Every structure is written in structure tokens, then in C-alpha cells.
Design a protein around this ligand. Structure first.
Ligand code: NAG
Ligand code: NAG
Lengths: 108, 48, 411, 97, 96, 48, 48
């Protein structure tokens, strides 16, 4: 076998000549670029989200949704106003969404 | 360069947006509008 | 015409209802799928106009629609309700449905079993956007709904959560289906034992029946198959000399290479459009399923539903929500009538020339005596002016029997 | 039958669908809504109608004092339905469409 | 502000509602339909790929969905209830 | 041409099948809440 | 309901306390079957 094919006809791996080593071909990192904006009327400040991209390709924050720059990650949670994905919503601050205020009912 | 030019009723180009200048201008080019409302917008794709 | 059947007992059954609420938020690209890394191919694609822009817009719409579906189905509580630290619920056990501190993902044993029951792409220009609500956050919404139901009944759905004793809440839910509150209080231990047994059987039913989670696995597999066929369609030639774009571009001169590239682009765009249209139809089906799930969460979980079979077979008492991958599982706690006995029944009873009809329930006769009892439970009571009303005479009702009505005022 | 075209027969035949409709009719007439909730609890049809009247906010005595008139109206309506469904073209237009 | 209209009588009406539950389960084979009894058109079709196996799957899904629709609409009863031999329904006539 | 025609027919059938499924879902809900039980929702099971 | 000194009967959706009487309460069985009940006086309107 000279090259390896993954399901649906993809060139997953190939054995190299002169070395016989099998090298896995992972497709080069690609992803859409989303723009977080509060609206030009409110502010011209803008944050950038690289979808499904590790924070290794050109404030920064790495999320399951990808690499987001231009927004500061804040621990405390707020109601979502702009959607980013992976449970995170977003100076521009990026936070984990708060599903609701906590209210324990005094059951008796 | 790709430019989004705003024509007026007279036909003079009163304003322009450079799509490659910065992400906000690229978003303005993607939405085909100078003013964008609050929200997420997918404008282009980054690939190495 | 003169015999009725009334159950002398009841069973508290729990039914599992699995509804898919969302699918993988997949998305493709104009060039990375139809063209690849080719400028000439992209220029030829530009002659076709904004076809791929329409396809991308539609896929973005379906992804946002999946996000909206999950938000509508699960985010039905304004504030997160927390279960009381002590589980003094009058004997009722919810450990199987309440989140457990031991599990890091904070998931009930039923919810954890559901995730472990199902088993689980992005290398050809494809992308799978993560869901806005994570597994833990959907589980937290489900836990909040479960706490609200067990602590406030339906009052938390209506507005502010009103603390309610769970046996008393279940007693009023019994009253809601036409069964008097006393029957639950006299049989609270039996109801709690039946409830716990049914909840325990729910885990056995989910873990011992293959394809029980098939309604969710089916949509997951259909999405996976659609992606697999879409990326297998790149291997198709569509009548071109070769499927690969690079070799045909390299080995063919411009005025015939462009014809071959156009033929491949027509085939690939038709494949992408078919996939997008099929995904839109599947998204419409999932949107309808999510609307049904949201309606079931509002009618069965947030309240008590009097429409039969909407929340499971039997008289619906109440229900529990559980998270599931791209889906929700409803545990419907319903009241099913049990061993029943026939009784000689009469529409009205003639006393002193006056026709008496039951204010609630019906008149029954066990052979020698007549009593008034609720329809859903055999609780015979002596015929009195308190539970019967008088209207007209005994000559109008087709079925009339003679019996004495006891008014407490006379003794 | 044409080239490349076939019509798969429905899994449920019309006769079996009619049997299902007959079973539903028998359950509704004999046990009211009880057969839907669970075991079919037999009930006299006037008593079931009286509880349906109670369900729509009319006391059950109203049907019993008017049982003959109510049965006469019901029979007249059912007979009229057959005439209306037979004399009106496109009444089944939804299926024909 | 002080007047109410109350019905002294009633009419029991019957209304017909017609709802389609299923459609003809039509199946079309791509290889026979677009390429009639010829091999060379089938070889040209194979370059197109999975388009019509996808179409056959879609038609199969429609047929299965129609069967499910009819079963869901009609099979709502676990047991087949049988009408009593005597039609003693208190004067209500169900012969129709 | 023939494959495009077959795809169009399949698409039209899929949309019509979705409409028939919606009608069948409504019919099943009517069978449950009007035939199997009594519905308090107005006009779901006829006028009156 | 019990405000802390006396018991009353009220509608669930509005707090309108009323004295426990035989006309707003119905008797079922005895006190040795119902779990978690308290003792109180049911004022019979006919008695005075
Ligand atoms: C009510 O109307 C019916 C006809 O629908 C009639 O036969 C009957 O006598 C009427 N009853 C009264 C009380 O008016
Ligand atoms: C119902 O009507 C039909 C025809 O009008 C008649 O033959 C039948 O006897 C009637 N039913 C009863 C129980 O009399």
C-alpha cells in the first residue's frame, strides 16, 4: 500500500518513498472568521472569532467555538446579548451565558 | 482592492468602505451596508 | 344500560417519551467544497452568481434554528430552581432523576444512562459549530425544571415559585384528573412505592431495550450519512475525465479544462444543493419535533395536561424532563385505573317523588345497597343531600331506581 | 403501470383501517373516553353523554330530562350528514386534491 | 352592564372534517427511469454518482413515513373493541 | 435533463409528503383529543 | 392554611382565609389512614 484512504475517499495517510514511513495527512487548519460587534451605531470596537481554529494562527481567548480575539474573558456570567457558541456570549467582554438567576424554593 | 461605495441621490460617491482595511469594514462589505446592527457575522474564511 | 365498571384500585405508571430537539449544526463553504484551493475554479463559480451564498445562508439559518430550538425547549424557566438539601418528599424518591453530586457532569442516573446508551467529518471544507447550550448547561436547565416541578408543582411555570408539599401537590394533581384528594392521602405509601418502582423500572427499560434511544440515534445517523454522501460525491466525476480538480486543471488546456471544470462544478453544486435542501427538510422535521417537545414541556412538565395521550397513556398526573444528546426524554408520571368491578348504576334516584342526581361521581349498587362514588376510584359513600342535587320528578328520567337520601339535618 | 414506476401497496389495507375505525367507534360508544386512558370501562351511553354534558358546563339532568329530544336531534344530524356528504360535490375534495 | 343572554334550548349538530393521512406510496428506480434498458447510459450515470440512490432513499423515506402516518392516525387502540350485539343505546342510533 | 426532472419530482413529493405528515399529525391529535377523549379547546373538534 | 395560630380554608390562587366548615370541606374515611394531618374544629353551620 502506497497511500491510505479514510472513509468517503479521503487521502488520510501516505507511505513516503526512501523512508517507507507512513505519514498522516491532516488537512491544513481552516475555519470561518466571525465578527463580534455591538453595532456600528453603538461602537466601532470589534472582536474576531476564528471558528474551529486553535489559538496558534494569526486580548485572546480559546473556546470550543474557536480562537476569539478583541474581547476580554470575564469569569462572572451575564444574560447573552451576542451569540458566539459553546455556551459563551459577549469594551467587548466574553462570558459563559447565565441560563437564569438562581432561585431555590424553601421546600417543606 | 474591493470597495463598497455609497452613492447619493445626486450620484456622487459620498462615502466608501475598504473591505480589507479591518474586520469591521469587511463586515460592512459582507452585509452590503455601512451600518451593521449588533450580532455575529461570518465574513470570510481563514485558512493557512 | 344499567351497569357501570369502576376501578377499585390504581397504578402509578411512568412512560418514556424521547423527542429529538436539534441536530449537528453543520456548515459548508463555496470554494472549500465546490472548488477546493483553485482560483480559476472560484472564478468559474462566480459566473454562477450567489448560489453558494444562498446555500451558506440556508445552512447558517438551520444552525441558528437548531440553537433556537434548544433554547425554546429547555429555557422555559426564568430562574434556576435548586432542590432542597433534604429529600423529605413524603416517601417519593427522585434520586434517579435528580442530579447527583458524585457525578462531575452533575447528571441524574437516568440522564447519564441516556448519554451512555447512544454512541458517537470536518476535513473537507466542512464545519460542525458547537451548540450554544453545552451538555452541562442543558443538564442544569433540566435540573432546574425538575426542582421546580418537585418543589412548586406548576406554580413556578405560571410565575413565582410557590413552595408546595410534594404529597399535597400530587394530591391536587390527583384532584385534577377527577380523583378526590383523600384517595392519595389514604394510599400515600402505596403511591410512593408504586412511583419509586416505576422510576426504577425506567432505568431497566432504557438500559435493557436496544433502539430505545433510536429516535435520537436515527437523526444523528441521518446527519452523519448526509455528510458522508456529500463528501463521497466529491469522488464522483459527473461525466468529467477525473473527479480530482487539480490533475484535470494541470493536464488540460484552458478552453477544454474550463468545460470539464464547469461540468464538475455543476455536478458538485447540484450535490451540495440536494444536500442543503434535504438538510432543510430534515431541519423542518426537527423544528416540528422541537415545537412538540416545547409544547410537551409547557403542558406536561410546567403544568398538568388534561388532553389524553399528549403526555403518555393514562390520566396524566405530571412529568419529568431529562436531557439527551440533541433531544429531551420525558418521564410521564400517569395514573392508570386498576382492578375494576361492575356495579348496577342508575342515572337518578327517586326519593319523595323527587329525582336526585350525583353532584360528583355516579350512583352504584353492589347488589343490595346504593352509594355515590367517584368515577375513577371505587369509594362508596352513603347517598346524602350533600353529594346529590334534586331537579324535577322521577317520571322524566328513563332510568330511575328507588332509594332513601339521608339529609344530616333530619337526624 | 409505467416504465420505472411502481406503487407499493399500503401496509394497512382499507379493510384493516375500517376495522381500526370500527374498534375506535365501539370503544367510544361503549366506554366513552375511559378506553383511551386505559382499560375499557363499560358505561351506559346516556350516562357517558351526561358526563360529556357535565364536561361542557351543562348539568347532567339537562340531558336526562331531554334524552328523547337529544336522541332525536342526534339521529336527525347523523342522517343529515350522510345526505350532506352525498349531495355535495367536492365535500371529499381534500382527499381528491 | 346588567344584561345577559342565556340559551333556553340547544341543538346537537354533527360536523364533517376531512383530513388526508397518507399519499400513494410511489417508488421510482433511477437506473430504469433515466436510462432505459441500456448499459452505456448506466455507465454515464455512474459518473454522476449517488444522486439517484439518494433519490431512491428519499422516496423510500416518504413511503415509510406514509405507513407510519396511517398507523399513528388509526392504531391508537391496543385492543380491537367490538360493538355490543344489542344496539340498546338509550335511543341514539349508530346504524349509520 | 431526466435526472433534474426526477430530482424536481422527488423534491415536490418530499414537500407534499411533509404537508401530508402535518395533516396526519393534526388528524392523530384530533383522533386522540376528539375521539379518544373530550376536548375543551374551541373549534379543535368542530363548531360549538 | 395555618397563619400560625388558627387554621383556615382558602383558594390556592388567592389568600382569602375562611373558617373550616362542613360546607367547604368533605369528610372521607378516618384519621388513621391519612398521613401528616393535624387536629382542628370543623364548625358545623347547622349546630349553632
Ligand atoms: C328545543 O328545540 C327542539 C328542536 O331543536 C324542540 O323540539 C324542543 O321542543 C325545544 N324545547 C324547548 C324547551 O323549547
Ligand atoms: C336506525 O335507523 C335505521 C334506518 O333509519 C333503522 O333501520 C334502525 O332500526 C334504527 N335503529 C334502531 C335501534 O331502531
Amino acid at each position: 500500500q502506497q497511500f491510505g484512504r479514510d472513509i468517503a475517499d479521503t487521502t488520510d495517510a501516505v507511505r513516503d518513498p526512501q523512508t517507507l514511513e507512513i505519514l498522516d495527512i491532516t488537512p491544513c487548519s481552516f475555519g470561518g472568521v466571525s465578527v463580534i460587534t455591538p453595532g456600528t451605531n453603538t461602537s466601532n470596537q470589534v472582536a474576531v472569532l476564528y471558528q474551529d481554529v486553535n489559538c496558534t494562527e494569526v486580548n485572546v481567548f480559546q473556546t470550543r467555538a474557536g480562537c476569539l480575539i478583541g474581547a476580554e474573558h470575564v469569569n462572572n456570567s451575564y444574560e447573552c446579548d451576542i451569540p458566539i457558541g459553546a455556551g459563551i456570549c459577549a469594551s467587548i467582554i466574553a462570558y459563559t451565558m447565565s441560563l437564569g438567576a438562581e432561585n431555590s424554593v424553601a421546600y417543606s | 482592492r474591493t470597495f463598497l461605495l455609497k452613492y447619493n441621490e445626486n450620484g456622487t460617491i459620498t462615502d466608501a468602505v475598504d473591505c480589507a482595511l479591518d474586520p469591521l469594514s469587511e463586515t460592512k462589505c459582507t452585509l452590503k451596508s455601512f451600518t451593521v446592527e449588533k450580532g455575529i457575522y461570518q465574513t470570510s474564511n481563514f485558512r493557512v | 344500560n344499567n351497569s357501570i365498571a369502576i376501578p377499585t384500585n390504581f397504578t402509578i405508571s411512568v412512560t418514556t417519551e424521547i423527542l429529538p430537539v436539534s441536530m449537528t449544526k453543520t456548515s459548508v463553504d463555496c470554494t472549500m467544497y465546490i472548488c477546493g484551493d483553485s482560483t480559476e475554479c472560484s472564478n468559474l463559480l462566480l459566473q454562477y452568481g450567489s448560489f453558494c451564498t444562498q446555500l451558506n445562508r440556508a445552512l447558517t439559518g438551520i444552525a441558528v434554528e437548531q440553537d433556537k430550538n434548544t433554547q425554546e425547549v429547555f429555557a422555559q424557566v426564568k430562574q434556576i430552581y435548586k432542590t432542597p438539601p433534604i429529600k423529605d418528599f413524603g416517601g417519593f424518591n427522585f434520586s434517579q432523576i435528580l442530579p447527583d453530586p458524585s457525578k462531575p457532569s452533575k447528571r441524574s442516573p437516568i440522564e447519564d444512562l441516556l448519554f451512555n446508551k447512544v454512541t458517537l467529518q470536518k476535513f473537507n471544507g466542512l464545519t460542525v459549530l458547537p451548540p450554544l447550550l453545552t451538555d452541562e448547561m442543558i443538564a442544569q436547565y433540566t435540573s432546574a425544571l425538575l426542582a421546580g416541578t418537585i418543589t412548586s408543582g406548576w406554580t413556578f411555570g405560571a410565575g413565582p415559585a410557590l413552595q408546595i408539599p410534594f404529597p399535597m401537590q400530587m394530591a391536587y394533581r390527583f384532584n385534577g384528573i377527577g380523583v378526590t384528594q383523600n384517595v392519595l392521602y389514604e394510599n400515600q405509601k402505596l403511591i410512593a412505592n408504586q412511583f419509586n418502582s416505576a422510576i426504577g423500572k425506567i432505568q431497566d427499560s432504557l438500559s435493557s431495550t436496544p433502539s430505545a434511544l433510536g429516535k435520537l440515534q436515527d437523526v444523528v445517523n441521518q446527519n452523519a450519512q448526509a455528510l458522508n454522501t456529500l463528501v463521497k460525491q466529491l469522488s464522483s466525476n459527473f461525466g468529467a475525465i477525473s473527479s480530482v480538480l487539480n490533475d484535470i486543471l494541470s493536464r488540460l488546456d484552458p478552453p477544454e479544462a474550463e468545460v470539464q471544470i464547469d461540468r464538475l462544478i455543476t455536478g458538485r453544486l447540484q450535490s451540495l444543493q440536494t444536500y442543503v435542501t434535504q438538510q432543510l427538510i430534515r431541519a423542518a422535521e426537527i423544528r416540528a419535533s422541537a415545537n412538540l417537545a416545547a409544547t410537551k414541556m409547557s403542558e406536561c412538565v410546567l403544568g398538568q395536561s388534561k388532553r389524553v395521550d399528549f403526555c403518555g397513556k393514562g390520566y396524566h398526573l405530571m412529568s419529568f424532563p431529562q436531557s439527551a444528546p440533541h433531544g429531551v426524554v420525558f418521564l410521564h408520571v400517569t395514573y392508570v385505573p386498576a382492578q375494576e368491578k361492575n356495579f348496577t348504576t342508575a342515572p337518578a334516584i327517586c326519593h319523595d317523588g323527587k329525582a336526585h342526581f350525583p353532584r360528583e361521581g355516579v350512583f352504584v349498587s353492589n347488589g343490595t345497597h346504593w352509594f355515590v362514588t367517584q368515577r375513577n376510584f371505587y369509594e362508596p359513600q352513603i347517598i346524602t343531600t350533600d353529594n346529590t342535587f334534586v331537579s324535577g320528578n322521577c317520571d322524566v328520567v328513563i332510568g330511575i331506581v328507588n332509594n332513601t337520601v339521608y339529609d344530616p339535618l333530619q337526624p
